[PDB]
């Protein structure tokens with residue numbers, strides 16, 4: 001088969017598509033192009049031919065194989081934010097990615113994943129006793145900020161554990177994400193004219209500088225430590241590899257940065273959407289509270305509990321299915337291949353539109369929010385909210401643990417009301433790199449009223 005998608009009008013086809021991405025935002029552009037042309041189609045971002053694909057088979061093929069274990073984006077943009085061949089998230093150097101990832105993978109599983117369940121709970125508790133920091137005169141909680149703060153505190157105390165300005169760093173993290181999102185697929189042209197990106201350049205510097213203070217402190221503590229054997233966090237593992245020959249300081253410093261931002265960027269917005277769903281679906285809220293009573297009572301949440309929380313698990317999966325945050329995944333072809341029908345040369349970019357695929361493929365009632373969609377054990381080849389394979393989400397296991405931990409410990413204690421008729425559907429969303437609330441609008445607050 002030849003490849004569907006708009007005409008290559010001898011060099012105008014690329015400019016409209018890229019412009020459309022820049023104009024619409026990556027997510028809505030992908031959805032537009034999949035709705036117009038096929039669920040497997042071609043488009044251009046800068047030069048590079050870039051496939052936008054929603055077919056479950058292609059998704060599976062692509063994520064399954066090692067020769068798609070790269071992403072893509074502006075080299076000038078990635079350099080600007082420090083992800084060019086440095087971290088893991090947008091580190092597209094295969095060998096350098098290959099050696100860095102294992103650090104992330106160790107820290108996000110085994111004993112750290114077990115520690116996480118109580119670290120996550122204790123963090124939320126402490127922030128729920130300080131609700132004055134987040135609540136209005138009219139009782140409106142800034143949930144986004146609350147969640148971002150506990151997610152940061154959580155990440156810090158598990159992976160780095162240096163004291164920090166929670167409030168300031170959360171703002172800086174948002175600044176960094178905005179920049180990352182802004183520059184990821186900007187054309188080279190953009191980067192010449194400098195009163196168009198210094199804005200972003202400074203947001204990056206602010207976060208990078210703030211984190212350099214913390215890693216500096218962390219460096220001192222490691223050098224003057226007695227029991228080096230006993231207390232081995234992520235940041236330390238990295239720093240010790242730098243002290244062997246294995247890693248660059250620059251690379252370490254980005255990995256630490258990338259681990260701290262991860263949860264605040266994605267969990268906060270995911271749980272935000274999950275709370276608006278619980279607010280407007282009392283049928284499900286009871287099922288969850290019932291389950292929590294059966295399973296936990298008023299014992300502290302414990303690792304053994306999380307497997308048992310089956311209803312909440314389905315709620316999480318359906319929330320992510322129905323109203324995602326990470327609705328699309330950027331990959332790159334490292335070797336030539338035939339993919340379903342069509343041929344894909346190496347260097348071809350790929351945007352897997354997993355958000356669309358979860359409304360087209362396996363599910364009984366795809367366009368409404370119901371736990372009926374997860375009544376029958378869903379095969380992992382029809383529902384990848386995290387991705388899988390050699391470059392799937394490194395947080396995928398611990399993320400589910402963390403989301404259960406915070407939902408339990410919040411709902412345990414509080415009923416959650418949304419303002420007005422507001423719901424996930426009526427919230428106005430930006431749909432660019434991720435899918436998140438447009439925070440220049442308002443009515444995004446909630447009300448926490450107790451229980452018993």
Ligand code: HEM
Pocket residue numbers: 063088089090101104108259262263266267270326328329330385386387388391392393394395396398399
């Ligand atoms: C609701 C929460 C989350 C969702 C939905 C999510 C989703 C994803 C997805 C779809 C990817 C792309 C994987 C692929 O290309 O196949 C990804 C990558 C990644 N996620 Fe997450 N994630 C979440 C939370 C987290 C957390 C909490 C962490 C770390 C603490 C994390 C760390 C990462 C990293 C490091 C990668 C890059 C892996 C690589 O490129 O090698 N994620 N995530």
Ligand SMILES: C[C@]12CCC(=O)C=C1CC[C@@H]1[C@@H]2CC[C@]2(C)C(=O)CC[C@@H]12
Pocket residue numbers: 071089261262263265266326328329330331433434
């Ligand atoms: C989950 C994630 C990482 C941790 C973080 O801090 C923020 C995000 C949101 C954007 C995700 C990204 C991982 C890679 C993703 C899936 C892509 O290939 C396109 C969008 C992007």
